[PDB]
Amino acid sequence: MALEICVKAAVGAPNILGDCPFCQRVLLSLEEKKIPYKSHLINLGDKPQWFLEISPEGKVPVVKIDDKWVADSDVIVGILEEKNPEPPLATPPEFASVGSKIFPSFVKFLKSKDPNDGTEQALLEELKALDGHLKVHGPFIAGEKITAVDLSLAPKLYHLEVALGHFKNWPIPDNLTHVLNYIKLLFSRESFKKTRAAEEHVIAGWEPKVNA
Ligand SMILES: *SC[C@H](NC(=O)CC[C@H](N)C(=O)O)C(=O)NCC(=O)O
Known part of the structure; x- marks a missing residue:
């Protein structure tokens, strides 16, 4: 039970x-x-x-x-x-195709021994390919509602905002008009807001995991 x-x-x-x-x-x-x-x-x-x-x-x-x-x-x-x-x-739409590239590439952004300055030139086009079709659906990274692509990515975007913010606070431009407003939704609902870690305790968890 x-x-x-x-x-x-x-x-x-x-x-x-x-x-x-x-x-x-x-x-x-x-x-x-x-x-x-x-x-x-x-x-x-x-x-x-x-x-x-x-x-x-x-x-x-x-x-x-x-x-x-x-x-x-x-x-x-x-x-x-x-x-x-x-x-x-458990229904993955078209957003899972781009979201499954974002899924490891945003972990590699937080492990950027291989430069983040060169990696980001692909991440802006990964975000545009997702955001260009998400702005037709409106609210969530899987489309009209939360499904597998939000469950793949939503906490990783807040983890980037916090842990990358500690050394390279990388801005999302308003051209990514779903992504820049979806990050503000992570501070809302039961589903995102209850899951928010303590932000010093993200950064002091992530430092040795730049290596490990
Ligand atoms: S997040 C910390 C480690 N877990 C994972 O990386 C889980 C990866 C899976 N594919 C997943 O669940 O998505 C972890 O537990 N590390 C052990 C340690 O000793 O730190």
């Missing part, structure tokens, strides 16, 4: 969330559904021994759906948006 979820505790502050935007996806779909769940803050620097019985890689996120474990957040989202008591949302 029920839903139990294991998620990133902050570095040094085990009672709050820190850097794992992949955990923030799982909170986002549960809070869009408003469905009852139970959350377990895992310290990744000192992992509970029983946590390997839930996640064989020792990673977060991992969940229990009806007490049965599921790891990796794109698989966890795939099962939650297909096999749950609230309506299923």
Whole structure:
């Protein structure tokens, strides 16, 4: 019965969330559904021994759906948006084609040993290719409503705004007229606003993950 979820505790502050935007996806779909769940803050620097019985890689996120474990957040989202008591949302439209390039390229932006100044010249055209069709639909990165492309990207855009803001506060121009207003929606709803990490505890989670 029920839903139990294991998620990133902050570095040094085990009672709050820190850097794992992949955990923030799982909170986002549960809070869009408003469905009852139970959350377990895992310290990744000192992992509970029983946590390997839930996640064989020792990673977060991992969940229990009806007490049965599921790891990796794109698989966890795939099962939650297909096999749950609230309506299923596992429908990827055309926005998943560009969004699946943005998905790793915005993690590589936060790991830009390979220059971000050269990478950004592709990211502006990735954002234009998404935004040019999203401005026909209006509100969300999957179109008229939240589906898999918001669940793939929404916490990663807020994580870029915070963690890239610490050294290269990269502006979204008003020509990206969906993207620049969609970032303001991350401070709203149950689905985005409840999932917002403490912003120092994103930055102090992300620094060693420029390397690791
Ligand atoms: S976010 C911190 C690490 N998790 C992941 O990177 C999850 C990637 C998956 N494909 C996903 O769920 O989407 C993590 O748990 N690191 C362990 C550590 O010891 O820090």
